[PDB]
C-alpha cells in the first residue's frame, strides 16, 4: 500500500468480459460506467494500481472516504470512472513463518493527495524535537507490519485490490475494446461495415493487385469499388446491389389485358423469360 504499481497500459483490445472469468474475484464494483457499455468506449491509457489490504478495509477503497488506509496510503477522488476489482489471496500469501513483509504506514502528518505514492522511510518526527534518527519517547517507526496468518478468519486475510483508473486527455484514444466479426458471404447482395466503410453490395472475387499499404479503394468518380478484407489478405470487389427500371408493355386496354414486364439491367438470374440487351 505504500509502494503500489502504476502500470500505464495502452495499445490493446481491452476485453473486460475476459476479466470476469480469469480468477474467482470477490468484488467487481465499477463506479463510472457499466461493464456492458465499457467494451464500446475508447480510452487513451489505463492506470493499473494494485495493493494488498485486509478484508475489513475493502470498504475503505471508495471515491471519497476516511480511514487508516483511505487517507494515508491511497485516496480516490470523486471522479473515479474505473472499478474496484478485488479478491481474496489467502492461498499463497499466508504461511506460518512470520509475515513481517508488508506495512500500512500507521503514522502520518496529514492526508495525502489523492492518487499519490509516498515512498519514504524516514523516522516519524512528532514535533517539538529535532530527530536526527532515534527511537524513544519522541520518534518511532512510522511503519507497522501486518499479522496475516493462515489459521485466521475472513476479514483479516490478504485481499489483493487492483483499480483501473481511466483518463481522457487531449490525445487520441488507443485502447477501445474487442471487435467481433462475421462469416464472409460471397455472390450475394448484403450489407458491409468494413472498418467504418459502410454500404451494401455483392462482395465478389476480383483480380486487382492492391499495394501492401492500401486498404480501401475508389473509382474514377467518387464511388467505392473494392476493399481489402480486414482478416487475412484478400482482394474483393464491391458492386452495388440489384437495381433496375420496370417497364410495362401493353397492347392497350381495348383488345385484351395481357401485359409484359421488362426489367432493365438484370441478368434474369437476379430478379416465358427472355434476355435481351
Amino acid at each position, epitope marked *: 500500500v505504500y509502494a503500489w504499481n502504476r502500470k500505464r497500459i495502452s495499445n490493446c483490445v481491452a476485453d473486460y468480459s475476459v476479466l470476469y*472469468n480469469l480468477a474467482p474475484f*470477490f468484488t467487481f*464494483k465499477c463506479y463510472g460506467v*457499466s461493464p*456492458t457499455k465499457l467494451n464500446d468506449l475508447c480510452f487513451t491509457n489505463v492506470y493499473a494500481d494494485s495493493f494488498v489490504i485486509r478484508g475489513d478495509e475493502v470498504r475503505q477503497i471508495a471515491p471519497g472516504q476516511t480511514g487508516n488506509i483511505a487517507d494515508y496510503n491511497y485516496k480516490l477522488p470523486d471522479d473515479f470512472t474505473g472499478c474496484v476489482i478485488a479478491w481474496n489471496s489467502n492461498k499463497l500469501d499466508s504461511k506460518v513463518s512470520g509475515n513481517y513483509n508488508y506495512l500500512y504506514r500507521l503514522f502520518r502528518k496529514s492526508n495525502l493527495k489523492p492518487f499519490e505514492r509516498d515512498i519514504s522511510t524516514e523516522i516519524y518526527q512528532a514535533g517539538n524535537k529535532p530527530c536526527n534518527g532515534v527511537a524513544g519517547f519522541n520518534c518511532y517507526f512510522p511503519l507497522r507490519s501486518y499479522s496475516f496468518r493462515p489459521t485466521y478468519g475472513v*476479514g483479516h486475510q490478504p485481499y489483493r485490490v487492483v483499480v483501473l483508473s481511466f483518463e481522457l486527455l487531449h490525445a487520441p484514444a488507443t485502447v477501445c475494446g474487442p471487435k467481433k466479426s462475421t462469416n464472409l458471404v460471397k455472390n450475394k447482395c448484403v450489407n458491409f461495415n468494413f472498418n467504418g466503410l459502410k454500404g451494401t453490395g455483392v462482395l465478389t472475387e476480383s483480380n486487382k493487385k492492391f499495394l501492401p499499404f492500401q486498404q480501401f479503394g475508389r473509382d474514377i468518380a467518387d464511388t467505392t469499388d473494392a476493399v481489402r478484407d480486414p482478416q487475412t489478405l484478400e482482394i474483393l470487389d464491391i458492386t452495388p446491389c440489384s437495381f433496375g427500371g420496370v417497364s410495362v408493355i401493353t397492347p392497350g386496354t381495348n383488345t385484351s389485358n395481357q401485359v409484359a414486364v421488362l426489367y432493365q439491367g438484370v441478368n434474369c438470374t437476379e430478379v416465358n423469360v427472355f434476355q435481351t440487351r
Partner: single-chain antibody
Amino acid sequence: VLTQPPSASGTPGQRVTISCSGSSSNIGSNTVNWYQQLPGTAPKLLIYSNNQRPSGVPDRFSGSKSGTSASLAISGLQSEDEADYYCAAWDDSLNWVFGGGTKLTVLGEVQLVESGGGVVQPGGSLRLSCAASGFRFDDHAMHWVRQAPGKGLEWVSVISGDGGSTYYADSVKGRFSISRDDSKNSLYLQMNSLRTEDTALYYCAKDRSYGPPDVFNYEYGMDVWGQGTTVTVSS
C-alpha cells in the same frame, strides 16, 4: 424492481429458458442470483454470481448475464425440476430486490432452524430468534428473507459477519432492530410498529460473505436455508 415470468410452462425432454429483466442500477452493476424452492420445503441456492454453482447443484443448470438481464437454462429438465425459481439482486440504493417466481410446472451439514413466531397482539410484537450448530458464525453474514404463505419472497434486513453496519428494507426501516451477541450462533431481530401485514415465515438465511453485501458485489450469495416458524399475526 425485477421483471420475471409469473407462471411459464414447458415439456419434458427439451430445455426451457427462464429470464429476468432488470435495470442497470441493480443488475447492470451487480450479479444476479437464482434460487430454487420446492413446494413445501425450504428454499435452496441454485446459481450464484451467474458463473459458478454450489457443490450440491449438479451441471443440469446454467446461467448467463448477457447485457442487463439474466438468463437461465436447464438442459434436460425432468419432474424433479418442478419448483419455483426466484431472481435476486442487490441494487446500488442499499437494498436487495427479489423476483416474483416462475411456476415451471411440467405434468409429463449445519442446521439453521429458527423460531420465535406465534400470534401476538397487533401494534406490538416479540423478538425473532435464530440458531445454528458450529458453522463459524463470525465468518459469515445473515439475512432475513420472509415468505408469505403462497406469495413470493422478499428481503428484510442483513447483518454482516463483522457486526458493524447493517441494512434494512424500504418498509422495515427504523422500526426494526437486528443484532447479534457474543454467545453461540444466534441472531436477534426485534420488530416494532406492527401493521398486521407481516404474515410470513422470516427465514433466517445463512450467507458466505463476511461484510455487508454492498462492497462485495461478486461473492455475495446465500447458503443453505433453515426451517422457519409460521408467525401469523392476523391482527
